[PDB]
């Protein structure tokens, strides 16, 4: 409970840092307290369904599926950061399933789309996902916290690929 609190505090500091500067890059040294924790995934990923993201896409050699996952995660990170930009992109309100970059990266994994819903892309058109007309701007806290979790998971997978994750054997539990 105490370790869990320290984690949440660390999570909030990083999410706030993303709200001030959406282009802010985090070093592995910065992410260390979020990486070194022995807390379960459910207590560390509050918005992202990390276990389902990993487990439902673990098909074949890790060296391939972890790489595919990273690729989806890196693009999902860019979607989040763009929503935090002091100047939001024109057409931030919707993402098309048939976007070349979206199809080849995010739609390559199971649950890729659900992550856009966490950002606020809750409305479903057969062409893609949109914000509701009633939402005029993105909830910045929700967005920052999802973006951070997306970046954290990508960071975790990257160390697994390199075999340098602090809890590497305990994470191959799956």
């Amino acid at each position: 409970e105490e370790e869990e609190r320290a984690f949440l505090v660390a999570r909030e500091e990083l999410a706030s840092a993303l709200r001030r500067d959406s282009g802010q890059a985090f070093s592995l040294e910065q992410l260390r307290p979020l990486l070194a924790s022995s807390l379960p995934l459910a207590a560390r990923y509050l918005q992202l369904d990390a276990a389902r993201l990993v487990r439902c896409n673990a098909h074949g050699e890790p060296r391939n599926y972890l790489n595919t996952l990273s690729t989806a995660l890196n693009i999902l990170e860019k979607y989040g950061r763009n929503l935090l930009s002091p100047q939001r992109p024109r057409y931030w309100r919707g993402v098309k399933f048939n976007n070349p970059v979206f199809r080849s990266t995010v739609d390559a994994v199971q649950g890729g789309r659900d992550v856009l819903r966490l950002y606020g892309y809750t409305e479903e058109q057969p062409d893609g996902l949109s914000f509701p007309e009633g939402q005029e701007e993105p909830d910045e806290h929700q967005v920052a916290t999802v973006t951070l979790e997306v970046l954290l998971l990508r960071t975790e997978l990257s160390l697994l690929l390199q075999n340098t994750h602090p809890r590497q054997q305990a994470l191959e539990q799956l």
Binding site: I75, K78, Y79, N82, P89, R90, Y91, W92, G94, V95, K96, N99, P100, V101, F102
Partner: peptide, 4 residues
Amino acid sequence: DLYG
């Protein structure tokens, strides 16, 4: 681009 991500929104096309």
